[PDB]
Amino acid sequence: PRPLDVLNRSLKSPVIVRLKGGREFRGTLDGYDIHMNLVLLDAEEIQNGEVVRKVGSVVIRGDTVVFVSPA
Amino acid sequence: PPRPLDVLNRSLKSPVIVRLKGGREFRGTLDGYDIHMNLVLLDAEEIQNGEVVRKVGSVVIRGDTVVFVSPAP
Amino acid sequence: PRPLDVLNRSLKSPVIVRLKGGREFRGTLDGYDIHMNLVLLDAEEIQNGEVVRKVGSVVIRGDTVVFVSPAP
Amino acid sequence: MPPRPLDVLNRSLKSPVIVRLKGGREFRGTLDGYDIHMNLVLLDAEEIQNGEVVRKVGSVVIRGDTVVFVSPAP
Amino acid sequence: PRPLDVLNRSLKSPVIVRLKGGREFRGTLDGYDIHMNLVLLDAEEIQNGEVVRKVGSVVIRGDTVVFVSPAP
Amino acid sequence: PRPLDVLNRSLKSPVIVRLKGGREFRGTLDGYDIHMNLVLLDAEEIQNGEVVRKVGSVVIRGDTVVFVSPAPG
Amino acid sequence: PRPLDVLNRSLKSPVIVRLKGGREFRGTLDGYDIHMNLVLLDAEEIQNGEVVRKVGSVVIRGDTVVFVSPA
Ligand SMILES: O=c1ccn([C@@H]2O[C@H](CO)[C@@H](O)[C@H]2O)c(=O)[nH]1
Ligand SMILES: O=c1ccn([C@@H]2O[C@H](CO)[C@@H](O)[C@H]2O)c(=O)[nH]1
Ligand SMILES: O=c1ccn([C@@H]2O[C@H](CO)[C@@H](O)[C@H]2O)c(=O)[nH]1
């Protein structure tokens, strides 16, 4: 298929997003686009196992993503 | 289905926190934005892992610098 | 053979992907695209040539990739 | 219920501004112009590293790429 | 007198591909495209004189390449 | 598109260029182009304010530039 | 008065290429393109001032160039 297809197959389901530099985000994938900018709902920022803050929602720049996976 | 830029829009005039590469944060009112994700914040504060470094009437942030944007309160 | 061509010749077969900084993955190449983003089913993250974890599947930003090679 | 990023930049032509470059340094000068890329031109400006003035220049042309943020300095 | 041309005049011949970071690859140039992505057959990964891997073939993102040269 | 104009107003006049990282150049601006690649004549590589080496001319990649500023002195 | 024109005025002549990261290249400029990719003939990879390697020729990714100079 197309990687963007699998992304769409994950809408409304939980996911794990990895970022350059080390940090991770966990939550519900709401939307996305050709830049791979992502939108998460009810998410936690994670650094080396420990949470570093919760957020009602976030908009991440695709240019910061390494990979995304379902949980 | 809901898209990134859309959510930004749904947040114009309200307060937001902008993360940046390196670690410096910003808190202010999202005034505007363009397609390359540049941002415009009014009455914002630069945040150094905790404390406040500077306060500005307004600020024009390069999109290429942002890591994420989150609605505050 | 075109770079993108050789990749296609591997759809469904196992592969190893190496990202900038070390992180290596091992799984089935499900799909790809222009930019070179990749989708991998049933795969394991491997920085140190061993096994560090597993993930039903993953979508990788082509920007992150260094190389892709068929896992004999 | 207005703006755009490039607009606010225009709304500062001829006024003093603070420019934050990637790395750490900064520039303080009169915003003379800009463009799509977001390249900037500054007049009678100073380079500043962690507080100290490192050099004064008649004017400077800053590659958009280098910029982190621009703000009007009141 | 055309970087990509030189690359072409080496298909099927042995080459040295230097990546960013320090690592290297020695193998047979198979394919290539506009971006400068490469395809190598029967290659070995090299880090400061030592072989860290042998592979049937590899697809290298142009983005990673520092340089490519022929080896008699 | 005014920055590119300023560069033009300096063609043949001396200038100082700074590249991402730290290296600085001083010489006569000869040419330039959309991308911001530059051509300098009789230039010198610099640190701490003065001379460190010389080159009849150099072609810098716009991708490497941080800033250019006209400088007789 | 155009960068790419100066390169061309150096075809078949010795040049020095400085790449990000530190290392340099010395050799005869053979070719180049819009991406400023370069081709060198009979070149040496110099590091910290020591000849670190000789090659019959190299194709240097433009993206890795800092600057090119004659003589
Ligand atoms: O003179 C130029 C040419 C390009 N760019 C911008 O720099 C980036 C490429 O490094 C692109 O966003 C491009 O728009 C500039 O800032 N100035
Ligand atoms: O010869 C070139 C080609 C591109 N670029 C710049 O590098 C950016 C991305 O590498 C391009 O958008 C362009 O602004 C250069 O500096 N020199
Ligand atoms: O074969 C290629 C393809 C792209 N680039 C340039 O390298 C940069 C990659 O970020 C971009 O400016 C692009 O124009 C090259 O140097 N060579």
Q: How far apart are the first and last CA of chain D?
A: 24
Interface test with D, best of B11, B62, B65 (most D CBs within 10 A): B62
Handedness of CA D16, D18, D19, D24 (dihedral sign): positive
Listed in sequence order, the residues at least 6 apart from F6 whose beta carbon sits closer than 8 Å to its beta carbon are D32, D33, D41, D59, D61
Selection from F50, G59, D12 nearest residue E3 by Cα: G59
Interface of E with G in 9-48 (CB under 8 A): 16, 20, 36
- One-letter identity of residue C2: R
What residues line ligand 3, using a CB cutoff of 6 Å?
E 35-36, 62; G 35, 37, 61-63
- Indicate the SS3 state at residue A2: coil
User: To the nearest 10°, the Cα dihedral for B42, B35, B25, F62?
Assistant: -110
Is D1 in contact with B13 (CB distance < 8 Å)?
Answer: yes
**CA-to-CA distance for F12 and F7, rounded, in angstroms?**
10
Residue A29, Cα to own-chain centre: how many angstroms? 7
The SS3 assignment for G51 reads: strand
Number of alpha helices (DSSP H) and beta strands (DSSP E) in chain A: 1, 5
We report the CATH number of the domain holding residue D41 as: 2.30.30.100
Q: Which residues contact D65 (CB under 8 A, 6 or more apart)?
A: B64, D37, F63
Ligand 1 contact via D39 beta carbon (within 6 Å): yes
Compute, in angstroms, the gap from residue D14 CA to the centroid of ligand 2: 30
Q: Is D49 on the interface with F (CB under 8 A)?
A: no
C37, two tokens: 């983003």
Residue A39: strand pairing partners: A31, A59
Name the residue among G2, G24, G28 with its Cα closest to residue G14.
G28
The full DSSP string for A46-65 is EETTEEEEEEEEEEE-GGGE
Residue with tokens 């695209």: C33
CB contact under 8 A, D66 and F7: no
User: By the 8 A CB rule, do A51 and A44 touch?
Assistant: yes
Cβ neighbour number for residue A12 with a 10 Å cutoff = 9
Nearest Cα neighbor of C67 from C46, C45, C36 is C36
* CA of E3, closest atom in ligand 3: 1
Beta pairing partners, A45: A25, A53
With a CB cutoff of 8 Å and minimum separation 6, the contacts of A50 are none
What total of structural domains would you count in chain F?
1
Could you tell me which of D4, D55, D66 has the C-alpha nearest to residue D28?
D55
Residue D64 alpha carbon, nearest atom of ligand 1: 16
Query: Ligand 2 in contact with F64 (CB < 6 A)?
Result: no
Neighbours of F71 (CB within 10 A): 17
Nearest CA to ligand 3 atom 4: E35
| Interface present between A and B (3 or more CB pairs within 8 Å) | yes
Which DSSP state fits B64? G
C-alpha distances out from residue C15 to C37, E28, F56, G71, Å = 14, 20, 51, 47
- Provide the 3-class DSSP secondary structure of residue C4: helix
C-beta contacts of D5-12 below 8 A and 24+ residues apart: D5/B32, D5/B33, D5/B34, D5/B38, D5/B39, D5/B40, D5/B60, D6/B34, D6/B38, D6/D34, D6/D38, D7/B32, D8/B31, D8/B32, D8/B40, D8/B58, D8/B60, D9/B60, D9/D34, D9/D38, D9/D70, D10/D34, D12/D70, D12/D72
Three-state helix/strand/coil letters over chain E: CCHHHHHHCCCCCEEEEEECCCCEEEEEEEEECCCCCEEEEEEEEEECCEEEEEEEEEEECHHHEEEEEECC
Scan for tokens 């592979």, then name that residue: E55
Residue D64: CB atoms within 10 Å: 16
Ligand 2 within 6 A of CB of F37: yes
- Rounded to whole angstroms, the Cα distance separating E56 from E41 reads 6
User: Is the separation of the CB atoms in B43 and B57 below 8 Å?
Assistant: yes
Range of the domain at D55: 1-74
From D33, D59, D63, residue closest to F69, measured CB to CB: D59
G48-67 per-residue burial string, b: 16 or more CB within 10 A, e: under 16: eeeeebebebbbbbbbbbbb
Do B34 and D72 make contact, defined as CB atoms within 8 angstroms? Answer: no
Experimental method: X-ray
- Max intra-chain CA distance, chain B: 39
Q: Using the 8-state DSSP alphabet, how is residue C63 labeled?
A: G
To one decimal place, what's the resolution in Å? 2.8
User: In angstroms, what separates the C-alpha of E55 from chain G's closest C-alpha?
Assistant: 24
What's the gap between Cα G50 and its chain centre? 17
Which ranges of chain D would DSSP assign to H, the alpha helix? 5-10
- Residue B67's nearest CA partner among C51, F67, A55 is A55
Count Cα neighbours of B39 within 13 Å in the Cβ-side half-sphere: 34
Give the closest of B1, B3, B70 to A55, CB-based. B70
Task: Give the three-state DSSP class for B7.
Answer: helix
| Ligand in closest contact with the CA of F7 | 1
CA-CA distances (angstroms) from residue E11 to A27, A53, C5, E33, E47?
A: 47, 53, 16, 12, 24
Ligand 3 centre to CA of G18 (Å) is 17
Report yes or no: C56 at the E interface, CB cutoff 8 Å: no
Contact criterion met (CB below 8 Å) for E67 and G60? yes
Partner chains of A (3+ C-beta pairs under 8 Å):
B, C
Which chains does chain D touch, 3 or more C-beta pairs < 8 A? B, F
Please tell me if the CB atom of residue F35 comes closer than 6 angstroms to any atom of ligand 2. yes
Quick check: B61 and B43 in contact, CB under 8 A? Answer: no
Closest residue by Cα to atom 10, ligand 3, is G63
Determine phi and psi for G8, rounding to 5 degrees: -55, -30
Question: Between the CA of residue A7 and those of C25, C32, C59, what are the distances in Å?
Answer: 19, 12, 8
Measured between alpha carbons, how far is F69 from D61 in angstroms, rounded to an integer? 6
DSSP for G13-36, written as a single string? SEEEEEETTS-EEEEEEEEE-TT-
| Touching subunits for chain G (3+ Cβ pairs under 8 A) | E, F
